Amino acid sequence: MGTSLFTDRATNQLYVLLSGQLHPVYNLTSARLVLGNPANPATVKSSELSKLPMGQTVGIPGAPYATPVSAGSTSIWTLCDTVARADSTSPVVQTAVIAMPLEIDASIDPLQSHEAVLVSYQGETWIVTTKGRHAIDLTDRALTSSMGIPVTARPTPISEGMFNALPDMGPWQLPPIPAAGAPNSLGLPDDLVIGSVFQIHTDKGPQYYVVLPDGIAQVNATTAAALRATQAHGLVAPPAMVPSLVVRIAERVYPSPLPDEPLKIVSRPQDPALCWSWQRSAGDQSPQSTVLSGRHLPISPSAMNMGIKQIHGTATVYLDGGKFVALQESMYYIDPQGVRYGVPNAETAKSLGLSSPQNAPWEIVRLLVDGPVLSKDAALLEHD
Ligand SMILES: [Ca+2]
Numbered sequence: 370m371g372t373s374l375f376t377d378r379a380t381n382q383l384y385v386l387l388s389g390q391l392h393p394v395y396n397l398t399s400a401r402l403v404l405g406n407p408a409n410p411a412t413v414k415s416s417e418l419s420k421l422p423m424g425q426t427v428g429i430p431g432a433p434y435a436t437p438v439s440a441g442s443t444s445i446w447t448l449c450d451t452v453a454r455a456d457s458t459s460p461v462v463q464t465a466v467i468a469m470p471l472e473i474d475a476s477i478d479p480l481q482s483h484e485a486v487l488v489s490y491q492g493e494t495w496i497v498t499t500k501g502r503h504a505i506d507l508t509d510r511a512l513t514s515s516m517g518i519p520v521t522a523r524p525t526p527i528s529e530g531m532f533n534a535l536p537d538m539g540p541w542q543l544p545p546i547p548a549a550g551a552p553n554s555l556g557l558p559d560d561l562v563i564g565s566v567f568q569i570h571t572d573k574g575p576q577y578y579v580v581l582p583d584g585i586a587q588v589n590a591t592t593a594a595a596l597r598a599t600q601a602h603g604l605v606a607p608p609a610m611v612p613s614l615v616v617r618i619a620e621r622v623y624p625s626p627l628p629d630e631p632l633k634i635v636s637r638p639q640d641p642a643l644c645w646s647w648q649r650s651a652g653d654q655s656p657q658s659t660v661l662s663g664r665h666l667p668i669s670p671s672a673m674n675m676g677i678k679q680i681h682g683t684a685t686v687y688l689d690g691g692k693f694v695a696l697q698e699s700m701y702y703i704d705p706q707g708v709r710y711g712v713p714n715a716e717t718a719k720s721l722g723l724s725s726p727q728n729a730p731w732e733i734v735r736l737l738v739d740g741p742v743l744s745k746d747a748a749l750l751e752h753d
Pocket residue numbers: 478479480481662
């Protein structure tokens with residue numbers, strides 16, 4: 370009848386009452402687990418512990434001592450790839466995860482819809498925009514130069530977690546023109562064959578169109594340039610057309626991922642930080658995935674002194690206190706050291722006094738060190 374948890378004065382070790390007699394315990398977490406409620410230990414003179422038929426140690430060894438947690442408000446989760454020696458041989462990428470509010474400026478901001486990051490992963494190159502990653506080839510020497518980028522710009526390494534965090538928004542590459550070259554069946558000049566590009570001067574500059582088998586397709590100047598570079602069909606300049614010719618021809622759509630603006634390949638030495646931010650204010654809404662580029666980590670210079678390089682881990686963890694997170698659900702507790710411990714059922718977390726687990730992206734939380742699983746079965750193992 371108590372009271373069921375005690376601490377010594379000389380050693381301050383935790384003791385829990387089991388049915389009739391007490392057992393010592395590795396951590397407070399295991400005690401609050403085996404009890405089923407978040408109660409605090411009672412400091413006690415060693416002689417009290419002495420005059421008692423003691424059992425032996427139970428609980429979970431590699432479990433966190435306690436389970437403290439910060440607040441929210443926001444559930445911010447960022448994953449940054451910083452790069453050292455961005456012109457070596459022999460380069461190296463230092464990655465990091467952030468679960469604290471960010472300090473975003475103009476030296477580390479999300480990519481504008483015209484700038485992108487050349488990247489390399491598993492022998493195959495990719496390109497990163499605000500949306501995600503797109504497959505690309507840097508071997509076809511001329512094919513690369515068709516869109517702003519040269520070959521004098523080489524890609525740069527990227528971590529696995531970063532690669533898997535970026536949604537594969539397909540490849541770059543202008544869509545296939547299956548009938549390209551065949552006599553145009555729309556009445557236009559025969560030298561303006563299918564797959565050719567022509568221009569019409571509207572009220573806001575010229576407008577470029579590709580001759581498709583089932584009509585004509587509006588494209589941005591970059592797509593026009595790329596198409597012409599691939600195949601111009603014996604045409605020096607895209608033949609100017611006057612509106613009243615195609616004003617009656619069926620208008621069609623041509624995907625083309627190329628931006629209307631020119632392409633600004635960021636300089637990884639001058640812009641080493643490549644991050645993926647994930648947000649959820651409070652309302653249901655949807656997660657807000659955005660890719661950032663910059664000079665440094667999107668946190669305060671002070672926060673840089675909070676980086677816990679995971680000893681047997683993958684990334685440096687920047688963390689403002691403990692977190693209680695829910696994926697998908699599958700729930701986890703993150704200790705201030707940046708280690709995820711599995712929290713099974715909803716009834717279990719009530720013992721640790723944990724409530725309202727924030728939503729967090731599994732893409733980021735999975736990079737955290739997977740510790741033991743906080744369960745009642747695992748917390749019932751005797752040791753000498
Ligand atoms: Ca920028």
